[PDB]
Structures are given as structure tokens and as C-alpha cells.
Design a protein around this ligand. Structure first.
Ligand SMILES: N[C@@H](CCC(=O)N[C@@H](CS)C(=O)NCC(=O)O)C(=O)O
Ligand SMILES: N[C@@H](CCC(=O)N[C@@H](CS)C(=O)NCC(=O)O)C(=O)O
Ligand SMILES: N[C@@H](CCC(=O)N[C@@H](CS)C(=O)NCC(=O)O)C(=O)O
Ligand SMILES: N[C@@H](CCC(=O)N[C@@H](CS)C(=O)NCC(=O)O)C(=O)O
Lengths: 284, 285
């Protein structure tokens, strides 16, 4: 194989995502989004990125902020729901999560999980230092997470778990980088309880959804063995602490095949068996 | 066909040119302190698109008269492992450029990641980022979009098309397709808006412009502009052309660059270059 002078879209690419991945953006059909009664309207799926948004909102509800009540509407990314006119209008990039803030007289969109986390942390004044050097430390780790997850999911996850052919050079490239990123976190968590200081912030939440899912064996087949996750004992400590947070236990279940399809009221969780909200096990 | 082992082992080089630095472990590999100059901001960087975000931002602030944005930009040679000295790891645990130390107050502190540097500076000086209101959310959305998507352009497309030792059709196709999709996102936005997050230039534009302009104008990744049909993105081209004319862009692009200044330690340093370099875009080597 020799790359052509001009790339053309003529072959399938993406494995399980080959029915949605395209070289062009924009909507593929006309459909409006549903709107509920609560101030925050979230359009998402319970992947690590969706979980950032729904955990953040559940964290705010644990603190008593009624302005954080939310409707979490299901977006099925294997089905192309991210390409409806209504979804593209709230996220031009056609990825979950995306949100509409309806808490004021004029609604507006917020897209990208990092922007959603920042927006909510700034609105309520929690989980992000409002000023001082600690703010810069938190932002540094949050942007680090956003800039590095593509290597873990779009790189390692894709080539290890979804690509139709196993490609040694690509698997090696992204397995190596994923381990390096876990080592960055592990070395930080050897010296600090949380990534950006002594307290849990949005930088921890953002990293945790990805790292905990991989570390505890729930993501990408046998990846936890493949990547020698046992090496990262400080990551493990921090995953265990965050796993225990009530807002994490609730938020991780939203838009999830193992939890709630959607969330429209706090009482929706009463439909689940009590075991679904109990401690995330660590052993085998 | 290849069969992955049960447990991954680091048994083969990976990275092409970058195989002399890419590792599955983090942390410092030598003890060396960072140099420190006289100015309030100390930047440790290289004039890649990500380094240019930092140096352009500082030059934009100096363009507005903010003397508190004066800076030393020290060169970090990423092919040679300068990013793994103890001094550099101390300011960026992730060992990537740009990173900086804010020495403007009584206690210095690190800021790492280009997006965090842009936000830190925009918040400090109250410019290039709406301080409140729905426009702030729009700006942050586009800025995080840039940071979350550049890995597909550089770590995906650029790597497989330009650096990997073997041309891998599936990987080149995956990331060429995604790079084009991201250009199309920007192109469709810029068809309806002068800038990404509204009518005015913000840090979201600066962050995206360094990458998109370098690819679009033909200076990144060999023949990528022809390969990716850059001529298709006329609104990206219009926006690149507008940002190209800003003096802070023209100066900041030249910092830590093999076609500009190796380092910046004072505003007069630019008088070492041909004067035309400050007046029109210079394409990198
Ligand atoms: N940088 C983005 C990444 C979001 C992302 O990868 N979303 C995925 C699910 S986790 C998605 O919606 N993919 C749809 C698609 O690629 O078509 C963020 O942090 O929100
Ligand atoms: N178009 C995407 C569809 C899959 C997708 O969006 N995956 C998510 C995780 S479910 C991902 O890798 N997100 C990267 C990030 O968060 O930056 C692809 O082909 O990789
Ligand atoms: N998300 C990071 C990406 C920074 C990045 O990719 N830095 C590259 C040069 S542009 C680097 O220093 N690479 C060194 C290495 O990989 O060893 C940011 O926006 O700052
Ligand atoms: N370790 C890196 C070294 C090269 C590198 O860091 N490249 C930069 C551009 S020079 C990149 O793609 N950064 C991704 C980003 O900005 O998110 C690799 O092999 O990809």
C-alpha cells in the first residue's frame, strides 16, 4: 500500500463505528430534541464522557443545589442520534455529552465534557478553586485529561478492541501511551491525595471516569490484564475513594444499560435494586 | 495476522523519529534545573502548534500594552528528551510542551497544558475570553473541543501519515477521515460566524488556528494539504487569513522556531530576524 495523492472516502473504516464515522460533519436528518421540566437538559450516553456530566450533576444535588436538577435524555451513538439536526444544533461536533442550560431566561448550549464540568463548577462555586494558584493546578490537570483521553479511547481502545484487524504497530503505540498516562497519574497520586491537591475536583472526576473503568476491568475486553493495571497502586487507591462517593454511585448509572435509560427525577433511582447503588467491588 | 499477547511488553521501538523518547513510563530521566530569566512569565516550549498557542497569547497581551505579560521563552528540544529533566517534569508531570511558571506574584506556580495556559492568561488579563454570560460557555466549548480533537490530527493523522516507519492504510484512513471531519466542523461554523465562538477573536480561535492554519497553508505533515483536500474548506481559509494578519500572531509564531528566534528574552530580540518576518507569515521548515 502507498497512500494516494488525494485521499478519497471509498472504503469502510471504524470497525463497530464504521456505520457512523464520516469525513464530513453536519446533520443527516431533521429531528428536534426533547425538553423536560428541569433547568439542565443533558443529551448523552453513559460512556466515560457522559458519566462526567451526570456524576457532576449528582454531586451538585448531593450538596443540596436544586438548580442542578436535570433531565438526561438518551443519545444512541451507534444509531446516529448524534447527527440529528437538533443534536448538531447543541454540539456541532456531534458527540456526547452536550447540554442546554435552561436555568435562565435565554437557553444556551454547552458542549464538550470539560466545558460542561467547568460551566457547572463555576456556576455553583464548587469542585474548582475560584482563584489562586490552586485554580491553575486544577485547570492544568483537567485539560491534561481532555487532551489525553483520545490516546486511550480513540487510540488504544479502537485498535485493541474495535478495529477489524489487529495492527501491532498501532496497538503498541497506544498501549505504550496509555501506560505512560496511567504512570503520570500514579506518580502524582503517590504524593497527593487527588490530582490537583488534597481535595476532589473536576480534574479528578474527568480522569476517574476513564481510569476507573479501565482499571477495574470493565472497558476494552482484557485490557486491564494487557496493560498490567496492577502496577498502578496509587491510581487504585484514588479510584477506590472516588468509587465510594454517593454522587458517583448514582451518576454512573444514568443513560446506562446497567442502570437508568434516562433520568427525569431523583425518584427514578428507586426503580433499581438496592445492590445497584452499593459499593463497587475491588477483588475478583 | 498478528496476535496480541496476554500481557503487553515494551519489546520494540515505536514512534519513528520519536522512538528515541516515547516510553510506557513517565518521570524524570536526568537531574537538571530549568533556567530562569527576569520576566514575570517563564515559558518552556518549542514552536510547534502547541507552543505557538502560548507565545502568540503572550505576544497578543503585549500588543495590548500589558507589561505584566513580558516573558522568557526557553527552548525545550523534544526530540532530545529535554522534557524529561527533573526541572521540566517538576513544572509538567506529563513531560510535554508548552509549560510555564507564573512568577508574577510572591509565590511562583506551574501551569501546564496549552489550554490551561490560554485560560490562565485570558482570566488574568480579562481579554480573549468572555468573563461571564452565555458567550463564556460557547468559548469554553470550542476551546475544549480543540484540545480534545488535536490528538486525532497530530497523534493520529500526522503520526501515521508522516512519522510511522510503515504506511498503514487502515490507520491513515481512520485519521485522515477524522481530520477532514474536524475541518468540516470548523468550516460549517465559520460559514455562519466570523470566529468560532462568536463575532470576535478569542482563545478558542487561537488554539484552533495554530493547528488548522499550519495544515491548511501547507507547512505541516509533508503533502497533507493536498492529501486532505484543504481547498475544500474555504471558510477555514478566510478565518486563517484574518488571524494571519494579527501582529501578535506574526511575532508569536517566530518564538522557539528554526525559522525565527531560538528563544525570546526581550522585545528587541526580534531585530535579529529579517524585518519582513514580522510582516508576513513565514512557513516552518
Ligand atoms: N472531547 C469530547 C469527547 C466526547 C466523545 O468522545 N463522545 C463520544 C462518546 S464518549 C461520542 O459521542 N461519539 C460519537 C461519534 O463519534 O460519532 C468530550 O470530552 O466530551
Ligand atoms: N468516532 C469514534 C466513535 C467512538 C468514540 O467516540 N469513543 C470514545 C469513547 S466511547 C472516545 O474514544 N472518546 C475520546 C475522548 O474522550 O477524547 C471513533 O471511531 O473512535
Ligand atoms: N494537550 C497538550 C499537547 C501538548 C503536546 O502534544 N506537546 C508536544 C509538542 S506539540 C510535546 O511536547 N511532545 C513531547 C513528547 O511527546 O515527548 C497541550 O495542548 O499542551
Ligand atoms: N510522543 C509524541 C511526540 C509527537 C507530538 O507530541 N506531536 C504533537 C504535535 S508536535 C501532537 O500531535 N500533539 C497532539 C495534541 O496537540 O493534542 C508522539 O509520538 O505522537
Amino acid at each position: 500500500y502507498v497512500p494516494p495523492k488525494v485521499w478519497k472516502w471509498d472504503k469502510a473504516n471504524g470497525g463497530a463505528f464504521a456505520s457512523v464515522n464520516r469525513p464530513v460533519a453536519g446533520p443527516t436528518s431533521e429531528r428536534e430534541l426533547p425538553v423536560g421540566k428541569h433547568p439542565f437538559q443533558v443529551y448523552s450516553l453513559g460512556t466515560p464522557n457522559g458519566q462526567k456530566a451526570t456524576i457532576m450533576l449528582e454531586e451538585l444535588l448531593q450538596l443540596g443545589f436544586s438548580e442542578a436538577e436535570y433531565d438526561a435524555w438518551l443519545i444512541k451513538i451507534f444509531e446516529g442520534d448524534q447527527f440529528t439536526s437538533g443534536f448538531v444544533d447543541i454540539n456541532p461536533n456531534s458527540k456526547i455529552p452536550a447540554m442546554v442550560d435552561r436555568s435562565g431566561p435565554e437557553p444556551f448550549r454547552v458542549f464538550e465534557s470539560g466545558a460542561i464540568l467547568m460551566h457547572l463548577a463555576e456556576k455553583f462555586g464548587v469542585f474548582l478553586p475560584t482563584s489562586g494558584p490552586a485554580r491553575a493546578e486544577c485547570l492544568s490537570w483537567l485539560f491534561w485529561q481532555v487532551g489525553s483521553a483520545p490516546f486511550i479511547g480513540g487510540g488504544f481502545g479502537h485498535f485493541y478492541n474495535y478495529a477489524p484487524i489487529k495492527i501491532e504497530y498501532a496497538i503498541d503505540r497506544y498501549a505504550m501511551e496509555t501506560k505512560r498516562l496511567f504512570d503520570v497519574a500514579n506518580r502524582r497520586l503517590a504524593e497527593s491525595r487527588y490530582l490537583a491537591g488534597d481535595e476532589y475536583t473536576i480534574a479528578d472526576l474527568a480522569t476517574y471516569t476513564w481510569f476507573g473503568n479501565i482499571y477495574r476491568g470493565e472497558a476494552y475486553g482484557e485490557a486491564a490484564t494487557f496493560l498490567s493495571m496492577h502496577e498502578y497502586e496509587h491510581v487504585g487507591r484514588w479510584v477506590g475513594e472516588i468509587d465510594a462517593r454517593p454522587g458517583v454511585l448514582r451518576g454512573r448509572l444514568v443513560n446506562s444499560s446497567k442502570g437508568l435509560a434516562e433520568r427525569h427525577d431523583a425518584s427514578d433511582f428507586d426503580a433499581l435494586p438496592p445492590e445497584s447503588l452499593q459499593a463497587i467491588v475491588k477483588g475478583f
